[PDB]
Amino acid sequence: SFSQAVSGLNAAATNLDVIGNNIANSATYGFKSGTASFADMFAGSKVGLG
């Protein structure tokens, strides 16, 4: 149950990376913001992988 939480921590870090990159480019001509999409990694149901 450690890898499952580590994966969520990594996903939150990626989200915050995207948010910081968007903020840093607040005034940058021709910049289009980014958005991170997440999907679960269920193996065979009844158990999660992160």
x-or-dash pattern for another protein, window 3-32, by CB under 8 A? xxxxxxxxxxx-x-----------------
d(CA 40, CA 12): 14
Which H or E run includes 18?
helix 2-24
Nearer to another protein, 26 or 46 (CB): 46
- Which 29-48 residues touch another protein, going by CB under 8 A? 35, 37-48
Angle at 16 between CA 31 and CA 24, to 5 degrees: 35
Binding residues for another protein (CB under 8 A) = 1-13, 15, 35, 37-50
